[PDB]
CSV table of C-alpha atoms in Angstrom, one decimal:
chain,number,residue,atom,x,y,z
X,1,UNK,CA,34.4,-179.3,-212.5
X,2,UNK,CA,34.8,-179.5,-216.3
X,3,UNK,CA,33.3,-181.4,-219.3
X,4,UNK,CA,35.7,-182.4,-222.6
X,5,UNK,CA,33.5,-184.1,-225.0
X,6,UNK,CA,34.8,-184.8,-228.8
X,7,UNK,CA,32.0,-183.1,-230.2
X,8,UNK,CA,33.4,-180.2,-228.9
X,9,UNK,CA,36.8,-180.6,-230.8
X,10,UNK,CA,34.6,-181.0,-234.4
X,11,UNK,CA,32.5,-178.1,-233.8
X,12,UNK,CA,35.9,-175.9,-233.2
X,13,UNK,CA,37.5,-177.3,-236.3
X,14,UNK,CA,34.7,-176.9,-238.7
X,15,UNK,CA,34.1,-172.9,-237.2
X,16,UNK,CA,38.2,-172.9,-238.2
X,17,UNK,CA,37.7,-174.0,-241.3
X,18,UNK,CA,34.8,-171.6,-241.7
X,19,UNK,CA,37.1,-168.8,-240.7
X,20,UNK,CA,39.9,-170.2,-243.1
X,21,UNK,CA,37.1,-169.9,-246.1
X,22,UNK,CA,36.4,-166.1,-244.8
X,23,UNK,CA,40.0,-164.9,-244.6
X,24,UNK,CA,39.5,-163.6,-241.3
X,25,UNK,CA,41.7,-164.4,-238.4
X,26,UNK,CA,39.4,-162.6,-236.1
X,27,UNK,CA,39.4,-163.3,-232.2
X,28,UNK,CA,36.6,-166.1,-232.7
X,29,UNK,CA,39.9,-168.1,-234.3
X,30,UNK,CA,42.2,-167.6,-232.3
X,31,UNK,CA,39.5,-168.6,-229.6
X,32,UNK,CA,38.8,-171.9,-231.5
X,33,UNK,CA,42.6,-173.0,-231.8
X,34,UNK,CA,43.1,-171.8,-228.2
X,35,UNK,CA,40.3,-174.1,-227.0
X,36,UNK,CA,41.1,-176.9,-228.8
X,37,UNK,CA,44.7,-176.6,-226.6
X,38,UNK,CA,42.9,-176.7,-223.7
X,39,UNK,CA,40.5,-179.6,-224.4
X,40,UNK,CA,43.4,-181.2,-225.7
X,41,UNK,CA,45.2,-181.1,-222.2
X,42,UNK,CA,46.1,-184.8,-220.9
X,43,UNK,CA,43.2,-186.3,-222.9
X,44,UNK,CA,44.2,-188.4,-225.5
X,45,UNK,CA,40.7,-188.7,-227.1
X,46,UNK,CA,40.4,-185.2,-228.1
X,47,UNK,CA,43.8,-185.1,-229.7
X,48,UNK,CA,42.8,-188.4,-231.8
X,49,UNK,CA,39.9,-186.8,-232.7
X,50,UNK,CA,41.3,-183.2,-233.6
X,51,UNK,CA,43.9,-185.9,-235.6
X,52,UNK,CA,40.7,-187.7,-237.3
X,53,UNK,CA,38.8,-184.3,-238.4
X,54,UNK,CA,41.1,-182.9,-241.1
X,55,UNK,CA,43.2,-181.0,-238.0
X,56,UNK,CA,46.5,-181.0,-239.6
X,57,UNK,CA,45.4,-179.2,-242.7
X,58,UNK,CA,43.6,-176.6,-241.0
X,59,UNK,CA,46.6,-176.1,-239.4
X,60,UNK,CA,48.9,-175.9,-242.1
X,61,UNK,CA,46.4,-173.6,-244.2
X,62,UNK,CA,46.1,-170.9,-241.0
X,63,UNK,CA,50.0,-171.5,-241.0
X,64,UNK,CA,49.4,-170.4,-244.7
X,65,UNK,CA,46.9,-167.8,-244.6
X,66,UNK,CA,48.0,-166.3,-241.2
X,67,UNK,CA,51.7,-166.0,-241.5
X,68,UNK,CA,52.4,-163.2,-238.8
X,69,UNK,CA,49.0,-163.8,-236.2
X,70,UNK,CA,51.5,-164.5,-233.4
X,71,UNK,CA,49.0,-165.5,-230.9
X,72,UNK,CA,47.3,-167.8,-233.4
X,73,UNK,CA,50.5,-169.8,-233.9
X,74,UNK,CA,51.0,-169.9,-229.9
X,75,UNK,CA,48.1,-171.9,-229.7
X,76,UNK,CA,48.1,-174.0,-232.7
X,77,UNK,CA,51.5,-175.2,-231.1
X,78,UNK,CA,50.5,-175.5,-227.8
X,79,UNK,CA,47.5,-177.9,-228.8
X,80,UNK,CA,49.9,-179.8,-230.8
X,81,UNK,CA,52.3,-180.2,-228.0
X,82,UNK,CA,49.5,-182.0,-225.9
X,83,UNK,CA,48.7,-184.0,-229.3
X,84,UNK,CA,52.6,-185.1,-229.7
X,85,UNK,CA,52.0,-186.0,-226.0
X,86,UNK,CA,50.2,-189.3,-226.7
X,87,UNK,CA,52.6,-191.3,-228.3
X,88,UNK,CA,50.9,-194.1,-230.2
X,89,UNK,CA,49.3,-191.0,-231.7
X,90,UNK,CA,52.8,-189.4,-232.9
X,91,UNK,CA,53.4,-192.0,-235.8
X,92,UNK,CA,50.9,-189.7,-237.8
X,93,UNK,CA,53.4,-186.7,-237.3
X,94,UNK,CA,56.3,-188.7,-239.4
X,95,UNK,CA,55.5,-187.1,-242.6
X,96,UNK,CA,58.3,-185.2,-244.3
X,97,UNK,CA,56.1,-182.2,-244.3
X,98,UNK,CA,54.9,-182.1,-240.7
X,99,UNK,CA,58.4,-182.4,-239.5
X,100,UNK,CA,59.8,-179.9,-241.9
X,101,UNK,CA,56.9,-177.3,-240.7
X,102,UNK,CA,57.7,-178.2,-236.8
X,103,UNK,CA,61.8,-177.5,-237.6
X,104,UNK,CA,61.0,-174.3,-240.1
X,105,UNK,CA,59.3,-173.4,-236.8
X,106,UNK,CA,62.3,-173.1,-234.5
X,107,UNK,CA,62.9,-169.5,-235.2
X,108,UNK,CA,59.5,-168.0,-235.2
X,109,UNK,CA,59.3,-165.2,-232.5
X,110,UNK,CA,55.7,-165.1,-232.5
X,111,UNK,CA,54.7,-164.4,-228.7
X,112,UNK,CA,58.5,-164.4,-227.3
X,113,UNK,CA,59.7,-168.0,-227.4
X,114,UNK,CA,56.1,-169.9,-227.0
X,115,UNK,CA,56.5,-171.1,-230.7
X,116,UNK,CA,59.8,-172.7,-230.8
X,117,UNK,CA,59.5,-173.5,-227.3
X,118,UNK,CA,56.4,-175.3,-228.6
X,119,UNK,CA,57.7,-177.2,-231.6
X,120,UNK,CA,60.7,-178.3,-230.4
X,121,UNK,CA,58.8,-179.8,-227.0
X,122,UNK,CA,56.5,-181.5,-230.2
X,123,UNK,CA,60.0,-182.9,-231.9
X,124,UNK,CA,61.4,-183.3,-228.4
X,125,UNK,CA,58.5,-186.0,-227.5
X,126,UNK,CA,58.9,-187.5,-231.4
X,127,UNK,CA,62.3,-188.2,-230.7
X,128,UNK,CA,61.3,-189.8,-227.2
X,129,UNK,CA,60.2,-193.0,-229.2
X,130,UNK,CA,63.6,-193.3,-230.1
X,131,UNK,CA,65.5,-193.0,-233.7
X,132,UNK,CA,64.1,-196.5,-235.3
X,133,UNK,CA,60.8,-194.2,-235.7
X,134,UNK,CA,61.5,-191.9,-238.2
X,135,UNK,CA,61.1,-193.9,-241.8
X,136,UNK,CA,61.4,-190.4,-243.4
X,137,UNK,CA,64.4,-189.4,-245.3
X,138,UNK,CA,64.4,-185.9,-245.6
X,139,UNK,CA,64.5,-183.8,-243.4
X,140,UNK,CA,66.9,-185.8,-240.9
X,141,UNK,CA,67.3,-186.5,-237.3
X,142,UNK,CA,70.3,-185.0,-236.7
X,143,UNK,CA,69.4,-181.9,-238.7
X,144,UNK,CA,66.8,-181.0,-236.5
X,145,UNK,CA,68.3,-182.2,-233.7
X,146,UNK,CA,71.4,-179.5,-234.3
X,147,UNK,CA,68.6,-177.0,-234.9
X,148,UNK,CA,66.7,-177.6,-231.5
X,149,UNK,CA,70.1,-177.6,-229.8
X,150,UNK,CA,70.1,-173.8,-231.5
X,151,UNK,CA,66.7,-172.7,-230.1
X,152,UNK,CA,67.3,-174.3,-226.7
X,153,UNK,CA,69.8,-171.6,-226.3
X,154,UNK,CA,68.3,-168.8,-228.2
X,155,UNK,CA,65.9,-168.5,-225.2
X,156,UNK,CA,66.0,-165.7,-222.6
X,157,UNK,CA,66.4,-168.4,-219.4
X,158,UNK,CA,64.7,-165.5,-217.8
X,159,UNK,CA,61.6,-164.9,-220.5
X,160,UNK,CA,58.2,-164.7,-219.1
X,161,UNK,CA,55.7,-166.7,-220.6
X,162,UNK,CA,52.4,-167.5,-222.0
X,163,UNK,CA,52.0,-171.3,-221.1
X,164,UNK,CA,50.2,-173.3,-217.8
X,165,UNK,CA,51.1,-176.2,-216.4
X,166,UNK,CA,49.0,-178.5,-214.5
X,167,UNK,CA,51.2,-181.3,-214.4
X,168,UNK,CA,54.9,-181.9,-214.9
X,169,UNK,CA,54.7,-185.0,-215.8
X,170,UNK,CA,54.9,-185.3,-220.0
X,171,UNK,CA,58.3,-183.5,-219.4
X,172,UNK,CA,59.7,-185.8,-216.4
X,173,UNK,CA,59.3,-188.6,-218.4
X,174,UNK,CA,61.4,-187.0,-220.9
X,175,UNK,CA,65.0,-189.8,-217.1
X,176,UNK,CA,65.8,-192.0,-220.3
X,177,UNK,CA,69.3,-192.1,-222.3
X,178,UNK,CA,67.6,-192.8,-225.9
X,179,UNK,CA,67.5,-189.1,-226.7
X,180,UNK,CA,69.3,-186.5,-224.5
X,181,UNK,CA,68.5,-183.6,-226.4
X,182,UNK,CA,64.6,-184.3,-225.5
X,183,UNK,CA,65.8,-184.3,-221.4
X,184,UNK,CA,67.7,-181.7,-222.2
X,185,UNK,CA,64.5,-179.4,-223.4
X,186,UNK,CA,62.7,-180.9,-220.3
X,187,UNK,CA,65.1,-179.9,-218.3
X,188,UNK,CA,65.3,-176.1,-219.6
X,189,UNK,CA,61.3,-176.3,-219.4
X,190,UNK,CA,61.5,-176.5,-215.4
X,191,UNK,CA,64.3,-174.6,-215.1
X,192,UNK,CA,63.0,-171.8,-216.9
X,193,UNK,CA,59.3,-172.2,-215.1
X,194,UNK,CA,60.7,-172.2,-211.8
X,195,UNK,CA,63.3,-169.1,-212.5
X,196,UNK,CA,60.5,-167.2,-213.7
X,197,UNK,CA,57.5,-169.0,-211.5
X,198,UNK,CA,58.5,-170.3,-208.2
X,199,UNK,CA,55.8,-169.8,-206.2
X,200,UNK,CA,53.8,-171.8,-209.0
X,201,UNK,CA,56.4,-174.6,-210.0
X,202,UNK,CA,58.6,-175.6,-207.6
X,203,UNK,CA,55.6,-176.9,-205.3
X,204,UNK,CA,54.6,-178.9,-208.3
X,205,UNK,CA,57.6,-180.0,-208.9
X,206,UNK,CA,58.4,-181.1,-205.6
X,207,UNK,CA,55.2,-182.7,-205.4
X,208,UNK,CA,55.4,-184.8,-208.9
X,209,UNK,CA,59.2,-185.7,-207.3
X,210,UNK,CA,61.2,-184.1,-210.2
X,211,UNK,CA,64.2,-183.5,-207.6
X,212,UNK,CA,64.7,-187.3,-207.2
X,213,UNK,CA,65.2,-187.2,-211.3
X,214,UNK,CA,67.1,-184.3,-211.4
X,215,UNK,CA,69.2,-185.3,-209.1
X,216,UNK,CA,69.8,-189.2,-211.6
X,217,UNK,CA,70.3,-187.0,-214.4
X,218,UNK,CA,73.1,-185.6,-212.3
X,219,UNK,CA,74.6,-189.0,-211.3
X,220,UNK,CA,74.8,-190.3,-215.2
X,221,UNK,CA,78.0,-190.7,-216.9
X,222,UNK,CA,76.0,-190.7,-219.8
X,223,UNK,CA,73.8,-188.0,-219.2
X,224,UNK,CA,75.6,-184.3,-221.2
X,225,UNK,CA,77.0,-182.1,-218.6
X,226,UNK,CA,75.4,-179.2,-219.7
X,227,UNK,CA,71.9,-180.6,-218.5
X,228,UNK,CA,73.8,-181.7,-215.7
X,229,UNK,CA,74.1,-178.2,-215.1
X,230,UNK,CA,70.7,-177.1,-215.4
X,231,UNK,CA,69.7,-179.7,-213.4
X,232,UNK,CA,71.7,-178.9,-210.3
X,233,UNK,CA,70.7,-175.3,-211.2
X,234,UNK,CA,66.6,-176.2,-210.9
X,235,UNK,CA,67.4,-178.1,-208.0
X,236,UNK,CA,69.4,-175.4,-206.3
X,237,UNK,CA,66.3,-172.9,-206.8
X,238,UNK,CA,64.2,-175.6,-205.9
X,239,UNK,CA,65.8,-176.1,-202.9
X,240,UNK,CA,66.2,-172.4,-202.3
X,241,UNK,CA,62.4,-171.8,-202.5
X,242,UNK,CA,61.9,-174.8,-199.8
X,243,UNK,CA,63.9,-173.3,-197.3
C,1,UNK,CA,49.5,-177.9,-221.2
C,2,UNK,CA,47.1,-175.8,-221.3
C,3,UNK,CA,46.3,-171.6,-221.1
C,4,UNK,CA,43.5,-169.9,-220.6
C,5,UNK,CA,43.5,-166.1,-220.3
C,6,UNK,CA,40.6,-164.1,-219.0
C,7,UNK,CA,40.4,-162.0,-222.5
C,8,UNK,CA,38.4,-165.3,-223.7
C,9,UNK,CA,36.0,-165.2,-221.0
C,10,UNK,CA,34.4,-161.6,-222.5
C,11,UNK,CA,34.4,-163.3,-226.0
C,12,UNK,CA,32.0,-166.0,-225.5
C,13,UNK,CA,29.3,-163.9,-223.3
C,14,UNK,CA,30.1,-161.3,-226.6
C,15,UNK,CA,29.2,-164.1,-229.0
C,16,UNK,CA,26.2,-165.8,-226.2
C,17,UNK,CA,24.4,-162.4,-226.9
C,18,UNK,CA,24.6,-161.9,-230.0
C,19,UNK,CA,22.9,-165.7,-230.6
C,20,UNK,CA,21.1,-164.9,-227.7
C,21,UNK,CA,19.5,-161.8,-229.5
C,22,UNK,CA,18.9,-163.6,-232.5
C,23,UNK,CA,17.9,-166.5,-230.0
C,24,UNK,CA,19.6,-169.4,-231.7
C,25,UNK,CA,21.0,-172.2,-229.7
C,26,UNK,CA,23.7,-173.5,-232.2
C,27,UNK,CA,26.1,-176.1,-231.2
C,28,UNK,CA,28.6,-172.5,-231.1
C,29,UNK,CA,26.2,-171.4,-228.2
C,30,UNK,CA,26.0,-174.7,-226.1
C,31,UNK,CA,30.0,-174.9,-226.6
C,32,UNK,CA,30.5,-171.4,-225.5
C,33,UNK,CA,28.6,-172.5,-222.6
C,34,UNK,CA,31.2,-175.5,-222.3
C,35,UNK,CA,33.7,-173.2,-222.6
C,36,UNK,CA,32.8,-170.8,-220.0
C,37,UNK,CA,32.6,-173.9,-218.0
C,38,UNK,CA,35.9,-175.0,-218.6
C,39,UNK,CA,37.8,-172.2,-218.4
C,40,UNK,CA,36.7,-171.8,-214.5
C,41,UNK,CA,37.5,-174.8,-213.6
C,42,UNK,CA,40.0,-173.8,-210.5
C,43,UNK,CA,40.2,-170.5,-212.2
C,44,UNK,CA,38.5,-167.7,-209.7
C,45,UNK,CA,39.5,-164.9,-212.0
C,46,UNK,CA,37.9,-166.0,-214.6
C,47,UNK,CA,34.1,-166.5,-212.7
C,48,UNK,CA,34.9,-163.3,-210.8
C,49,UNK,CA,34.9,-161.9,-215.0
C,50,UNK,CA,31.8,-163.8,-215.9
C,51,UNK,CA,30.2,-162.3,-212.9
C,52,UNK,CA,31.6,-158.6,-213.8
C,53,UNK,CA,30.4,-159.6,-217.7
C,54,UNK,CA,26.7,-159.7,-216.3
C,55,UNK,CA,27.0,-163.3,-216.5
C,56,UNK,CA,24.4,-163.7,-214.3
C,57,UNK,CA,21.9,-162.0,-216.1
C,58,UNK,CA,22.3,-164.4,-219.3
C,59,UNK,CA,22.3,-167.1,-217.0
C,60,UNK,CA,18.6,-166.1,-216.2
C,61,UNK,CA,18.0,-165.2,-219.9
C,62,UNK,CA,19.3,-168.4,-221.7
C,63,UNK,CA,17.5,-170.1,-218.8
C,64,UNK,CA,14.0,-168.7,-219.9
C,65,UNK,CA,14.4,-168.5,-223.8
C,66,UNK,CA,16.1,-171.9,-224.2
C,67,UNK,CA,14.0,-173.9,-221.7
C,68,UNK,CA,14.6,-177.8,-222.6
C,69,UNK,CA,17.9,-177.2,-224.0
C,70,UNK,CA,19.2,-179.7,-221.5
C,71,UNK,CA,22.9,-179.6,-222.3
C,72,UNK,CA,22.9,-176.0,-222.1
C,73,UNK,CA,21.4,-176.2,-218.9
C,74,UNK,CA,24.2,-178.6,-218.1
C,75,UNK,CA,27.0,-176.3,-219.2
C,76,UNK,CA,25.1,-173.6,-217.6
C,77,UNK,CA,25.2,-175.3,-213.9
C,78,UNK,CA,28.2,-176.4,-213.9
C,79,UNK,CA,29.7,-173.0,-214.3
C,80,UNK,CA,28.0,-171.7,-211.5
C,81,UNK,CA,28.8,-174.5,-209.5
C,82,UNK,CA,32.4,-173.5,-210.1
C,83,UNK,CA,31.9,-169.6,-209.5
C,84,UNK,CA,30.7,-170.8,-206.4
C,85,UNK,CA,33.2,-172.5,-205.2
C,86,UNK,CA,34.9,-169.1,-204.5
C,87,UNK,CA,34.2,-168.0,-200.9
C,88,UNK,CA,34.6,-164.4,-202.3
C,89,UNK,CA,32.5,-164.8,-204.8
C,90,UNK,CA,29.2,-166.3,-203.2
C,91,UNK,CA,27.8,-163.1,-201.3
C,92,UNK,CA,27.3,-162.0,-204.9
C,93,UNK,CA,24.6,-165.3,-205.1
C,94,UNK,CA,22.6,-164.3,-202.4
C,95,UNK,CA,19.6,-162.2,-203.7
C,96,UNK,CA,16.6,-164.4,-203.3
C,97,UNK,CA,16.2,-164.4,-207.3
C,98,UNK,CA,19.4,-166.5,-207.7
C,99,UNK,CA,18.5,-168.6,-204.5
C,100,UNK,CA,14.9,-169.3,-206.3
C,101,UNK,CA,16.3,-170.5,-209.4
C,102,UNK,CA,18.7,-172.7,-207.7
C,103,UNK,CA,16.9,-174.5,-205.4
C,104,UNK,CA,13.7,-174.5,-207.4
C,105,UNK,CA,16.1,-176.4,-210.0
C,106,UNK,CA,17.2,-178.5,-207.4
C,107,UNK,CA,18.2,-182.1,-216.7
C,108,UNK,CA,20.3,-185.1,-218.6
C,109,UNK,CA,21.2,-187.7,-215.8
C,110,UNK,CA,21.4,-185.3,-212.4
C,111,UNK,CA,23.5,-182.9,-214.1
C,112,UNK,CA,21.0,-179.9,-213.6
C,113,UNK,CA,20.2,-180.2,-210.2
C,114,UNK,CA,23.0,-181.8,-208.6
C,115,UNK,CA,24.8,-178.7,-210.0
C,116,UNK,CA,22.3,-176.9,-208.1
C,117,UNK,CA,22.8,-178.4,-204.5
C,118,UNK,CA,26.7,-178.2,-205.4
C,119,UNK,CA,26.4,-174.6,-205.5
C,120,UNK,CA,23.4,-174.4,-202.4
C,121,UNK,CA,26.1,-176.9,-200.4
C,122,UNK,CA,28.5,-174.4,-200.9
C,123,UNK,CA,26.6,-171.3,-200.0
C,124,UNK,CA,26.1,-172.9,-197.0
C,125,UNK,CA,29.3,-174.0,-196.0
C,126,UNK,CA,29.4,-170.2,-195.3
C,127,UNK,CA,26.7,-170.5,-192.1
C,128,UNK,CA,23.4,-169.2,-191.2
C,129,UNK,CA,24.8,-165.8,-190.4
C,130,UNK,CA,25.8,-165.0,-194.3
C,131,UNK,CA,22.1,-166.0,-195.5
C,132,UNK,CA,20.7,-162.9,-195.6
C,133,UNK,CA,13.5,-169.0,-200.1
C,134,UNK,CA,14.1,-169.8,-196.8
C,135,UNK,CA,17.5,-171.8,-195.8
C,136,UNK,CA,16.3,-174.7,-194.2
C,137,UNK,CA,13.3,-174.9,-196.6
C,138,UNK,CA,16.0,-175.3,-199.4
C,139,UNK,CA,17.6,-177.6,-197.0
C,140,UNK,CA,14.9,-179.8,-197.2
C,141,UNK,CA,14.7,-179.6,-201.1
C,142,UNK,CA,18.4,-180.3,-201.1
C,143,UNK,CA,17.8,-183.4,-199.3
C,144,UNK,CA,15.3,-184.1,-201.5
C,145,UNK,CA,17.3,-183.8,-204.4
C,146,UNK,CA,20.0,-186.1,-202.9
C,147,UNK,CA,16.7,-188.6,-202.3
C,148,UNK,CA,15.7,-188.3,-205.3
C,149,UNK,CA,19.1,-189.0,-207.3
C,150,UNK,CA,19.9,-192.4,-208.4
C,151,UNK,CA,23.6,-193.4,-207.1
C,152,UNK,CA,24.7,-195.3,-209.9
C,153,UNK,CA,23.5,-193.6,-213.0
C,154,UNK,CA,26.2,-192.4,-215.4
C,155,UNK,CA,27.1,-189.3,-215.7
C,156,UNK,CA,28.7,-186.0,-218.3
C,157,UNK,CA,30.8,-184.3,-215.7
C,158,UNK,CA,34.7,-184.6,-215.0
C,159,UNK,CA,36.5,-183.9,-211.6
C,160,UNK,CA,40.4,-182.9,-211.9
C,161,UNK,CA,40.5,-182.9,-207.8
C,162,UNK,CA,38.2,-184.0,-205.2
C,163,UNK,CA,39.6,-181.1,-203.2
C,164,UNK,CA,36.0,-178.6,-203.4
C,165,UNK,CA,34.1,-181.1,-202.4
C,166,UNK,CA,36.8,-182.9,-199.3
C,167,UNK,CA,37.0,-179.3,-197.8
C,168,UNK,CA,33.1,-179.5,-196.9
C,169,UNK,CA,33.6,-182.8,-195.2
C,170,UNK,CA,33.0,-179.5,-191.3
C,171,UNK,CA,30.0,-178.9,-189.0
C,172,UNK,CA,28.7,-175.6,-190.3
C,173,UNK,CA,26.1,-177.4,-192.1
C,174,UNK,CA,25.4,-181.0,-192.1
C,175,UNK,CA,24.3,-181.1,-195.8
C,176,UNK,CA,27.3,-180.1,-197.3
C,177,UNK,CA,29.2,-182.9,-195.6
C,178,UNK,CA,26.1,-185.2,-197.1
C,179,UNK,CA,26.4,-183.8,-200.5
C,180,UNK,CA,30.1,-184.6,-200.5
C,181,UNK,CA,29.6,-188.1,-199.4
C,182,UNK,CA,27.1,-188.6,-201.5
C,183,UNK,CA,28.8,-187.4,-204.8
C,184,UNK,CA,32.1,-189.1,-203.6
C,185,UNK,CA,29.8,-192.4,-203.4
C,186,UNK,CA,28.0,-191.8,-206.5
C,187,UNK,CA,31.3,-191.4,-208.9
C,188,UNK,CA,33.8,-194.5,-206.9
C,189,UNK,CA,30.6,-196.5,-206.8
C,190,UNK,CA,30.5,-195.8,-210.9
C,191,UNK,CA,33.7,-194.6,-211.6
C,192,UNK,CA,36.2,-195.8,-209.4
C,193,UNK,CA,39.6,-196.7,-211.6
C,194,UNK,CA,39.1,-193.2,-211.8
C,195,UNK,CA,38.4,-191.4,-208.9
C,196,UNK,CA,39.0,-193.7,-206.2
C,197,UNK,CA,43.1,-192.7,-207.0
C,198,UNK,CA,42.3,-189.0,-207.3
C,199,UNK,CA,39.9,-189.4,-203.4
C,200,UNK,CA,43.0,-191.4,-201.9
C,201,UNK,CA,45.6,-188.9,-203.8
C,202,UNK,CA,44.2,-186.1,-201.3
C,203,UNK,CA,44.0,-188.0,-198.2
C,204,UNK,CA,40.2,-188.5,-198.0
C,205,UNK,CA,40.4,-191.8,-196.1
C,206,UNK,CA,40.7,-189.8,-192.6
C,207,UNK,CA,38.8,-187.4,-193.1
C,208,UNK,CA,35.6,-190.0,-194.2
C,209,UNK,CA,37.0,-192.1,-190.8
C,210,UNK,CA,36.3,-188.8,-189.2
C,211,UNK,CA,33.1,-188.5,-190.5
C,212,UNK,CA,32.3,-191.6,-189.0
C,213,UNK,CA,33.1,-190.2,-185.8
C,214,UNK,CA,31.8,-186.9,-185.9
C,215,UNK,CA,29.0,-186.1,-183.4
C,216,UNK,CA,27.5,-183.1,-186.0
C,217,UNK,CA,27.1,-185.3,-188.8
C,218,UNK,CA,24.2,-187.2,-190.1
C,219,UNK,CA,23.9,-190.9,-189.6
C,220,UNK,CA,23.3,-191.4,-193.3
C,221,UNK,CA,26.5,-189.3,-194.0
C,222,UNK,CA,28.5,-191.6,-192.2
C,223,UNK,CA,26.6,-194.7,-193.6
C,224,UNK,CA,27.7,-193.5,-197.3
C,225,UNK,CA,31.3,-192.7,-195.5
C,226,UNK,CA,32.2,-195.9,-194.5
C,227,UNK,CA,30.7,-197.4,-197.6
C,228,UNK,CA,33.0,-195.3,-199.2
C,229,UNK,CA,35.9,-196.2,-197.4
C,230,UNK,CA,35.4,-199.8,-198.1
C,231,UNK,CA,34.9,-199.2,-201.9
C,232,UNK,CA,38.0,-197.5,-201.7
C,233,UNK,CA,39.8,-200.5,-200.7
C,234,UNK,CA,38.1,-202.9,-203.0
């Protein structure tokens, strides 16, 4: 049993902002972003509302204020991946500046990967909606797109992680050919989560049918062979862990 | 995606007694309720630390010095109705204190009270043997309460899975089966685009065709059963 109600989302944003004013990334903070990433999870309400409350700013200004609070930045990102999950609501991330934050955000080893891993699965579901959607200029597509192709292999394939998933689905619909570098990260995302969490993540996958993607991503001539790779590489532990 | 680690737990019954010392129910307080709620959602660590955090003891003390706070009543009773779904957890409910409070709060909608026979149906999935109130005079009460509620009133709660409440639809005790039913009925009768997926999702359908045929359970169970069913379908 639960309860998400977008009061909830307000009252966390103005305590942040109240925090912000005080100069104090205390444990409170962190504990208001990392709510908001959990109330955020699959509910498209909350993150319209988080969008609707002066959220972006807050994040940017503990971005600002906050430069090395790893664990702060692991959840600011992690409730902006479930807000870049709701697609009619991603035309309000095409700003030149939210884009360029996401990207300067590749490289951050603030809690191991969960950063980077974060932005680039927020840029990985932007670029989902295909290129006519980005009417910025600066920074470009293919920029960015080099750059995530640099993070997706700066990560330990064996890294533990900070990050739960209850459902696979946001990534598996990542089965397209309109951006392969965004299948490519969702394919790295199970891979790594079942190398490092079978037990967890291969029942889940199995259950949502990822193996019946993976396997279409495999048996693609357009699909780039190195996700071809990975793919018959999550399949293979997949398959291991079944039998 | 979503994490919750149990380090966040401690927090809010840190910050609960410093407002609860002060005694001011803020919106802060009633959300760290909320949040306590949430985060044990399918999460028995995280009760089994909000027990260990004398959680149980602010549950009494927020009861008494905020006593028509409804929504913090709300958050309050659904948490426990989530610690106890935890078979390992429950012997930790039974002191006849707890039991008192429970039954004898067996409110915004049903919220309060069907929390309360949600955590009494649970206790006694267990049996009669792990009672060590009276357990069939909260029986009665708990059919009361389930008399009492109206089936189609709206409601501020949120199911992920049906799964808590489809594993005491059993023969251990009758009322937990009726309970089920009846919050199955309640939420496809009034919710159904979305619930009736998440009851089919888990096979429920054979288990409520069972219940039809099931010599321990209630005629009334079985009438909201096959109702059920047939909702399910339309």
């Amino acid at each position: 049993t639960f309860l998400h109600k977008m009061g909830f989302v307000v009252t966390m944003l103005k305590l942040i902002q109240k925090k912000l004013l005080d100069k104090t990334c205390d444990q409170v903070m962190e504990f208001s972003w990392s709510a908001l990433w959990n109330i955020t999870d699959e509910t498209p309400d909350n993150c319209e509302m988080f969008l609707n409350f002066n959220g972006m700013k807050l994040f940017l200004d503990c971005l600002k204020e906050f430069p090395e609070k790893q664990e702060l930045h692991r959840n600011m990102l992690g409730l902006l991946g479930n807000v870049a999950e709701v697609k009619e609501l991603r035309p309000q991330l095409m700003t030149s500046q939210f884009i360029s934050v996401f990207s300067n955000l590749l490289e951050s080893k603030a809690d191991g990967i969960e950063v980077s891993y974060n932005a680039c699965g927020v840029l990985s579901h932007i670029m989902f909606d295909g290129p006519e959607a980005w009417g910025v200029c600066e920074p470009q597509r293919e920029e960015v797109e080099e750059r995530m192709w640099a993070a997706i292999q700066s990560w330990d394939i064996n890294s533990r992680r900070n990050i739960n998933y209850r459902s696979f689905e946001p990534i598996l619909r990542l089965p397209q050919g309109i951006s392969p570098v965004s299948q490519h990260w969702a394919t790295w995302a199970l891979y790594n989560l079942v190398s490092v969490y079978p037990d967890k993540y291969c029942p889940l996958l199995i259950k949502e049918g990822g193996m019946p993607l993976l396997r279409d991503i495999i048996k693609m001539a357009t699909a780039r062979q190195e996700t071809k790779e990975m793919a018959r590489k999550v399949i293979e532990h997949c398959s291991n862990f079944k039998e």
